[PDB]
Amino acid sequence: NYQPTPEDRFTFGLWTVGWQGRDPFGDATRRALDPVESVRRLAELGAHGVTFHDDDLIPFGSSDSEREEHVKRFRQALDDTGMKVPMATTNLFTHPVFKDGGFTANDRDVRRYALRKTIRNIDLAVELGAETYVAWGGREGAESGGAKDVRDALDRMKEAFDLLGEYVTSQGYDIRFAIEPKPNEPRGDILLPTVGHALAFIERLERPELYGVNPEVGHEQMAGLNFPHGIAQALWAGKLFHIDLNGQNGIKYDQDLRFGAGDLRAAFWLVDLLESAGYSGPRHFDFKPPRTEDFDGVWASAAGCMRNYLILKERAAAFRADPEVQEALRASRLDELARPTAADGLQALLDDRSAFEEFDVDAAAARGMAFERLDQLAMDHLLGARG
Ligand SMILES: OC[C@H]1O[C@H](O)[C@H](O)[C@@H](O)[C@@H]1O
Numbered sequence: 001n002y003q004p005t006p007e008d009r010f011t012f013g014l015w016t017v018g019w020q021g022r023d024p025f026g027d028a029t030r031r032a033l034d035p036v037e038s039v040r041r042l043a044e045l046g047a048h049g050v051t052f053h054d055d056d057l058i059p060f061g062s063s064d065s066e067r068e069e070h071v072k073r074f075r076q077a078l079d080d081t082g083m084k085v086p087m088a089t090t091n092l093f094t095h096p097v098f099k100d101g102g103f104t105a106n107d108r109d110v111r112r113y114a115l116r117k118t119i120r121n122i123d124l125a126v127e128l129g130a131e132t133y134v135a136w137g138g139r140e141g142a143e144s145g146g147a148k149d150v151r152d153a154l155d156r157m158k159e160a161f162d163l164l165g166e167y168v169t170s171q172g173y174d175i176r177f178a179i180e181p182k183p184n185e186p187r188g189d190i191l192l193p194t195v196g197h198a199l200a201f202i203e204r205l206e207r208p209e210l211y212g213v214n215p216e217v218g219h220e221q222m223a224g225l226n227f228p229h230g231i232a233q234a235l236w237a238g239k240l241f242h243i244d245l246n247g248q249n250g251i252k253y254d255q256d257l258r259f260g261a262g263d264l265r266a267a268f269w270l271v272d273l274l275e276s277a278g279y280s281g282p283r284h285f286d287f288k289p290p291r292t293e294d295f296d297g298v299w300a301s302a303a304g305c306m307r308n309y310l311i312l313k314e315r316a317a318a319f320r321a322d323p324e325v326q327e328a329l330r331a332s333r334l335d336e337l338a339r340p341t342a343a344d345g346l347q348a349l350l351d352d353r354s355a356f357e358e359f360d361v362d363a364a365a366a367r368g369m370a371f372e373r374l375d376q377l378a379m380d381h382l383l384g385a386r387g
């Protein structure tokens with residue numbers, strides 16, 4: 001049951017199944033994975049494709065000749081399996097030179113290096129067929145108030161993204177950028193900490209059409225925010241270019257649990273929204289198999305990501321198809337929410353005595369919204385206590 005196939009557009013980062021389990025308090029518990037083995041194993045699980053940081057595929061500092069041999073092996077594995085590479089990104093956070101950031105490092109020479117390192121990987125990503133290029137500024141931020149002038153930092157961040165946009169347009173590349181927010185960790189506070197801040201920032205760039213967001217379930221939940229609401233706002237703005245699916249139990253360190261774990265009801269409402277809105281991009285899993293697990297548990301955890309999406313998709317479809325749920329939606333006036341408030345226009349509204357002078361405020365206040373009955377139907381469908 002719930003067998004994933006490539007049509008389902010499930011993708012995984014090389015760094016996910018390949019996480020060796022090193023955390024801030026303990027050494028690695030797993031050996032390093034060959035990216036070629038990950039491609040073949042994920043193909044066998046039913047995945048659609050893989051994603052990568054530059055440094056996941058080419059070890060940092062590699063000569064131009066070593067780099068070519070790493071890329072050739074990888075392409076051969078993709079060619080053999082039919083696996084796609086829909087997205088790629090840059091590692092601007094691991095090497096000590098980025099300890100104060102990349103695009104917004106205080107040191108100018110580091111910022112220029114950050115840009116050259118990124119541009120180099122855009123070329124490779126386009127060669128391999130990526131449609132989306134993600135930026136996660138995990139080191140852009142501060143632990144203390146005086147270390148970063150945030151207005152100057154946002155000037156430098158806008159500068160960097162404007163230069164990347166000039167670069168792809170000057171090359172005629174068919175690739176778009178997606179900013180991935182995170183509120184904190186590894187910095188005390190990270191710039192553009194939520195979907196909202198990233199969306200607002202994009203509108204100040206020179207070519208806003210080239211930029212969207214790559215929201216992550218766990219990251220918005222690290223700020224205690226409602227992830228489906230934030231996705232709804234990104235869709236409403238036309239900016240949901242990509243998405244990271246995983247699980248998170250509340251406000252704490254970034255857990256990256258398998259999708260479905262963490263806030264299960266949020267996951268249901270998320271899948272309901274993505275499917276009813278017709279989101280067509282990849283369903284990308286940014287998760288870490290816990291370091292308790294051996295390599296069998298790694299692949300079990302990866303399989304569980306896809307299984308939980310497919311189950312929730314079935315339950316959300318059953319929910320929306322139920323005539324009793326449709327009746328409850330009308331009972332809660334979800335359909336009146338779709339009607340314009342004042343399509344008759346401002347003057348008509350001003351002259352409408354039924355909208356104020358003769359509005360029976362007490363009769364309107366007495367109407368129940370019937371939200372609890374609707375939510376219990378949603379619960380019954382999630383739990384399969386009905387269909
Ligand atoms: O941006 C690409 C990825 O880089 C890092 O691995 C981050 O932990 C992850 O959140 C992000 O999606």
Ligand SMILES: [Co+2]
Binds near residue numbers: 218
């Ligand atoms: Co995360």
Ligand SMILES: [Mg+2]
Binds near residue numbers: 286
């Ligand atoms: Mg992510």
